[model samples]
Target: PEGPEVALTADILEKYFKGKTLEYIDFISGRYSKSEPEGYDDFIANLPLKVSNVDTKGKFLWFELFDPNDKSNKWYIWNTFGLTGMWSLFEAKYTRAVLSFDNELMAYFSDMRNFGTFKFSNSEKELKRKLNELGPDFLKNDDIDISKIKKYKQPIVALLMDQKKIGSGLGNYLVAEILYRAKIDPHKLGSNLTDQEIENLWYWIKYETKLAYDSNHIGYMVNLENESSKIGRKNYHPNIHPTEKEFDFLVYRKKKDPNGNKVIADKIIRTTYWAPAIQKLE
Candidate 1:
């Protein structure tokens, strides 16, 4: 998921986590199991706590919870979805952590890859230091280090996807869409990009992030009965939201653009998608 998805989730979770009390959260998997050694027992026992606020930095999400009785009692919960980590109102399979609230708002952190993490920090600095390593949060930042984008020897697509370099959620679908919009070849070396080409890329990186966030944050297999039916919809065709084998994107999942240019792909990795007639290689 990207920053937009993460942010939208914060709003939904904010209302739910606050007001209502957390009855329980079962940390079912490996990494999430031992996130805290010393504070582990105290953490579980302390919960039933009410969430105070939910916030995001790029794609990372963190929420603060407090005890009503002791105003000083507070905790933090954080998550960074690896490939596909999502929080949904509906029941889901592959839940890393299942949560139940006093108000009976049942939700789960659905992650098949197990890369998503839920952990806490006593001091805000512990988490803020982690966020500090990330590159500019594109959704919230106006200025970015374009020179750093041009310096990478990696392919433009890979470089753009690196959170350390172009942080805060430009995944395959997004980077493909951005490059498609910029009409730049995804396979081109980052260092080969002209100053103007780099500028165009920076434009779409911000533009796509904004449009993606601005666009009502528009999905997973909903039911087991229609699991086959839901695979393409909820699961990964890379771009999961669009339906009917017809894509809403300009090039990411498209066979051809409206202009009749064939949309080609490099199938090995995340499947770089582009219209060769328009996005010619540099």
Candidate 2:
């Protein structure tokens, strides 16, 4: 899974972690607080008492929580990280900054390389400042608009990665799928795409985006029972969605030509029914 997929995974985790008390575990023996990045002692000295919200910014997971303040209340706190920075919500006992609450879920973060470290901020202002560096997130609905994607015309493979544009979460697979759907060459200049192709691209983007989020970034399985009458699952073939196969993307498949050379060897190729039945377009 790439960054977009990772973001979707974090989104699912966010749903699971909300309203849960995350126990902050220090990879080292003493470091527990996200505030001080110094040595072990200065770290755990200011551990927060609880977690409140969990969100994804690109591939990073931003967790909003709190620390006990005066008596029973707490101060707002937040943290963000990724695979190199993950938090586990386990049931076992844990040491160092473990927060306990009735009907609360347990959470822990483990960074194998120690490269992922949680940062701290005093307020939302500080948090915003930190997240501002990340710019736009592709998977976010709010990130999609006309002005953002207007500048250039390039194949979507690279276009999807541009944070300033559509901000729609599309990794290599989705990129290939979108091109396959529109029957447009991935290498074709973005500006060269017909208005119809652009419309197709947008439709597939919304389609796959929902499927991706629904499945937690794990691509959906193609159920060919209707055609094959067999109950089997193929990992994310373009024909999976009920409305998708109608688009005829199923005709585009990786096959060896008569010379045993890959049909789609170098340049991008597409197959769709728009022209007249599903046929490959060089």
Candidate 3:
């Protein structure tokens, strides 16, 4: 759920966005999406509206659509990050009455899973309240400020997963990659970090984020002269190269767990592979 993956998916959805005005926005009854039912309605009602922009705040999409009514009720559709809330783009106009987009690029949401949410608000206060509730984010434009990076009482890995703190859009593999890069135990605490360590983590977040985004969420790619060769290895970029070994696949390369404790090789290897010097806190 990196920024680029979410952004790319949203873009794909936008492709089928033409010629469909919002008819209705039905939520999975008795869920967060329905919590602000009125707000949801107002959001859909505000559509038939053209899309002004498709912005990302961490993992969320801030779809700026045209509002026909006056300045007050302009609302945006919101989605929570989770498996149940995940949505895919479809072209069935049959589902139009339930969830359709307007010719202007406005659309409705209908999540059967009842896990995600959607809302509307004109005031920046309301928007900030909702987004801020999720806390700090690595993918976010906001950076470390005057306040010192405090030590956490919990594990660094779990801390990273907590959206209430940092919305880095890091999922399983991304988390492993981050931990690997930092070379810190996933179970380490935040308070354990030194100023420099925190700084390094911040930069690492940016680096990993760009990698995930650029390769269409695959996180890594090997540029070879021939695209159709089966035996050819993936050429690593200088940035992600593990060592000076040119054309070696060890960089960003995942290895199997000899113990079979971790389910996936990618998960086990990356999660444990770390550069202690880069990640260790004083």
Candidate 4:
């Protein structure tokens, strides 16, 4: 089965809806306003605002709203892209909360699980402060410095998943892909890794993340030849499961390692997938 649409990237946002003006804005889901500003009614009424800029921080997207007189500058941020969350554009008769543009286009934010968030910030500084609370975003940079990560005493897998430490882009799928590609054990302590291993981890994190983002498929399963092929679906169902017209994982949530040994899932982060036989403890 096909999965949900992947989260829109910075490039995707800039390409499609950057300069469009919001002719109307309506909430299709009740949870859409969970994190909305106190003045929810005023916020919705202030539509017909132009979208000045669209940017991404980690896995979240922010839209800079510009008013006619430039007296009000607000930012809209969305942070949930799991499973059924997506942003789509339609012509007419939409079923979800729609952001109708003056250009005869309608943008919709659909979240089947209702886990997505919609928030507004008064200033860019406030948004920046929120982003700073997460770890470094690998997609935002070509080279990532791992000096701070090396000093972390926690398991390297947990460290990678920690948004506050590395920034908020990575999820379970990317974490497994990064570790497996780097040939590092998930249970390996960050401080115990050698310089070369640390370097490899750093390299793969950025490399794999970019690969997934550029391809617009985070849940890409390298083991499967095609998402429809169904060969590895027996024991590796979760990893091979299709999501949004793409396969899910190569190593994450797998039952075995490359060497056919049993792979262990982290107890704390139960979804974490790694093999001790193939991945070096160091």
Question: How many clashes show up per model?
Answer: 0, 9, 10, 6
The TM-score, computed over Cα atoms with residue i paired to residue i, of candidate 2 is: 0.57
Give the winner by lDDT: 3 or 4. 4
- Candidate closer to the true structure by lDDT (higher is better), 1 or 3: 1
Best candidate per TM-score, number?
Answer: 4
Candidate 2 regions exceeding 4 Å error are: 2-16, 28-43, 70-105, 108-123, 130-138, 146-150, 216-282
lDDT by residue (89-147, candidate 2, tens digit) is 44222222333343655545444344444554445776676566554654455324534
Per-residue accuracy of model 1 over 1-282 as CA lDDT, tens digit each:
676567656666775566677778777764666563334566778877887888887778887878879868777777776666778666577767778888677867778887676666656677778788777776666676776766778788788777777666677788888888888887888888988888777777776766555443333322221322222211211222332232247777778876888998776346878887888666
Q: Which one wins by lDDT: 2 or 4?
A: 4
Quote the RMSD, in angstroms, for model 4.
8.0
lDDT of 3 by residue, 1-282 (tens): 445355544554454542234444554344543254436655655565544455555567655555544534444555553333334433222221145454333333333345444555556676677677665555444353412335456666666666566554665556656665666656567777767667767666666655554442242111111121222222312244232222221223344322222323323313333333333434
Q: State every prediction's TM-score relative to the real structure.
A: 0.77, 0.57, 0.60, 0.78
Clashing pairs in 2: 51-65, 52-64, 52-65, 87-109, 88-108, 138-167, 153-190, 153-191, 154-190
Ranking by TM-score: 4, 1, 3, 2
RMSD of each: 6.8, 9.3, 8.4, 8.0
| Best of the candidates, lDDT | 1
lDDT of 4 by residue, 133-232 (tens): 7665565654557767778888887887776685557777777777887878888888888888877776766655544543433432111213213222
Worst ten in a row by lDDT for model 3: 219-228
**Pairs in clash, predicted candidate 1:** none
What RMSD value applies to candidate 3? 8.4
